[PDB]
């Protein structure tokens, strides 16, 4: 609806601050390489012509190490075994895949790993036999809490020899919580006759020990899983070989892009250096914020793409991969489209049961508060996580409140009769700039902690109020036009 040239200028301005801010961050690193090298070990590899990589994120490095050693072979084994089952005995495929998942869990995490996954699943199943929402949620919450206790943690660490395997067990158990909670709640709600046969203990075990999603993979709905595992209609093995090749090309491109970002910009080492963060330029601050969120986006492309590719080979429909974070302009849109699987879990099992969006204003606040509180507790329940949850809860609330206010017939008619449609788009973009500034700030707390958040708040809004703040707001205003204009294509 905007004139073509105006939107073209917005796109140029948006691309401009991304790339110039990236240049600023690249220069600050390469200026403090020696200072950063003695506090953080910069890895040396021949991937980018002699640059050194920052390996401080701990999530990229942890999963990359496990993949080089064990995980890639086990995932590749899953697709080989899955194809053999379909060709030979497709009716029994779910149990074969479950059996492979148990063995793969064992050869990585020992007897204790398989034993603890089974114990959590068994307790959950037995409690679910009571057909109560409340009891199931309490049981899941207690099981989750046991992970984060001091005495339990000491006992767990004695089981393994390297603390790297202990972290893997923690990741695996945290993910399994959502799977068996989902199964137990669906069992509590089952009322149709034909569906009664899909809530047996063997089906729970097959859902839990499904290898592509065992360690970190996204939450996959139980409804999709059960429907495909009973299909007995394979999909032309040649076509599966075709889709594997295309998926591998895109996955390798994403991995190379993430590696490039780490070699060029030491964003993770720099957030670990608070005194340096307080003396870099404001352009450097903006570039560091942008690079952090984009690295997080690309990392989860890779981290969810591998399970997604395996599931598509199996004939499943995985949750959608994240939309690029350079296209997100609001709190509501961000949490609908980044982690689609987790968003679906929260809508079905946390949001609606509390009674969201039906009791009016007060009910919506309470429902959203519960959802954000669980996701904060599920991530570890640290202080910075609660700060992030409070900010995100507040942002979503304000967006919904404003949305309802402008959709009132009186105000809607008044603004329609007095303001042109193009002007209406401009105030929507202007307001989204303030929304997206706060959105970036909240997720910086998630990525870097309370200290990073306080540094950014003081150096963007207080120390540099009249002019630094306005430049950031003006750039985000152009950025928001691009995001809203693009969102008219999927939303």
């Amino acid at each position, epitope marked *: 609806m905007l004139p073509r040239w105006e939107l073209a200028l917005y796109l140029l301005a948006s691309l401009g601050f991304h790339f110039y801010s990236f240049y600023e961050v690249y220069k600050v690193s390469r200026e403090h390489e020696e200072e950063l090298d003695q506090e953080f070990e910069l890895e040396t590899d021949t991937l980018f012509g002699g640059l050194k990589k920052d390996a401080t994120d701990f999530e990229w490095s942890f999963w990359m190490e496990w993949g080089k050693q064990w995980l890639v072979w086990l995932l590749l084994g899953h697709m080989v075994v899955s194809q053999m089952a379909t060709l030979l005995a497709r009716k029994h495929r779910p149990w074969i895949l479950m059996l492979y998942g148990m063995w793969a869990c064992w050869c990585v995490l020992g007897t204790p790993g398989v034993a603890m996954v089974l114990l959590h699943t068994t307790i959950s199943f037995c409690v679910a036999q009571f*057909r109560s929402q409340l009891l199931t949620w309490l049981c899941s919450l207690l099981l989750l809490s046991t992970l984060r206790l001091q005495g339990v943690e000491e006992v767990k660490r004695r089981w393994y020899k390297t603390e790297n395997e202990y972290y893997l067990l923690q990741f695996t158990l945290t993910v399994r919580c959502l799977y068996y909670t989902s199964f137990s709640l669906e069992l509590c709600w089952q*009322q149709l*006759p*034909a569906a009664s*046969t899909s809530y047996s203990f063997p089906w729970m075990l097959a859902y839990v020990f499904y290898y592509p999603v065992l360690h970190n993979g996204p939450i996959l709905s139980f409804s999709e899983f059960i*429907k495909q595992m009973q299909q007995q209609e394979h999909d032309s093995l040649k076509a599966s070989l075709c889709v594997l090749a295309l998926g591998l090309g895109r996955l390798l491109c994403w991995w190379w892009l993430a590696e490039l970002m780490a070699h060029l910009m030491y964003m993770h080492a720099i957030y670990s250096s608070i005194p340096l963060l307080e003396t870099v330029s404001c352009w450097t601050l903006g570039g560091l914020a942008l690079a952090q969120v984009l690295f997080f986006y690309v990392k989860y492309l890779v981290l969810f793409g591998v399970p997604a590719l395996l599931m598509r080979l199996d004939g499943l429909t995985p949750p959608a991969l994240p939309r690029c974070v350079s296209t997100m302009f609001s709190f509501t849109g961000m949490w609908r489209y980044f982690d689609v699987g987790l968003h679906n879990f929260l809508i079905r099992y946390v949001y609606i049961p509390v009674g969201g969006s039906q009791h009016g204003l007060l009910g919506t606040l309470f429902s959203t508060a519960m959802t954000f509180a669980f996701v904060s507790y599920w991530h570890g329940g640290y202080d910075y996580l609660w700060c992030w949850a409070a900010l995100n809860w507040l942002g979503v609330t304000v967006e919904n409140g404003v949305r309802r206010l402008v959709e009132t017939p009186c105000i809607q008619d008044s603004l329609a009769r007095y303001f042109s449609p193009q002007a209406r788009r401009r105030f929507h973009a202007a307001l989204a700039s303030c929304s997206t500034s706060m959105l970036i700030l909240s997720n910086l707390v998630f990525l870097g902690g309370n200290e990073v958040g306080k540094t950014y708040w003081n150096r963007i809004f207080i120390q540099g109020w009249p002019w630094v703040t306005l430049s950031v707001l003006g750039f985000l205003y152009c950025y928001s036009h691009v995001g809203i204009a693009w969102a008219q294509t999927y939303a």
Partner: antibody
Amino acid sequence: IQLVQSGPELVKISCKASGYTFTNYGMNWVRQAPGKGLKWMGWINTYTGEPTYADDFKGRFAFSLETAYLQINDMATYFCARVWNYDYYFDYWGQGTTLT
Amino acid sequence: VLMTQTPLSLPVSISCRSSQSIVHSNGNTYLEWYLQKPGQSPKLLIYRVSNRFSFSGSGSGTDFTLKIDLGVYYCFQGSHVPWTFGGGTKLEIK
């Protein structure tokens, strides 16, 4: 075990259920027009409150819960029937409401 | 799913036939026979194929049959959404 409906009507039909825990089982609605046979219209989950409708009953009709009391909002007579958990569908039926 | 019953009215064997196989994805065939007296509500007779709810007609495959008071008999499938009722078979008094 009783399912009593809201008499003749000339719109909201009610179905009140007795003798069993109301939240355990779902509730179904069917219609029988004088010139044709039975037609299933849809059902509602009496635990979560989530109904599904047949394709040709979409939009105009809605199911509502008032938990041991269930409502639906065209010369057919409408029956509410309780659906079992497994192995068979319609165990008990209401006596019907005649709509004119 | 659409079904037909034959014959419509027989004085004193009801056959229910479907275009699509009635086997559900879970491995069960959900087909039932209901009896409705004149002026009353339908009553369940055999809770699945060949097994009685409280007669004892049996069938298999696509075609289904019921063997052996006065009323109208309907055949019902629950395996494929939306669930579908039969035409109904009037049973004559004579």
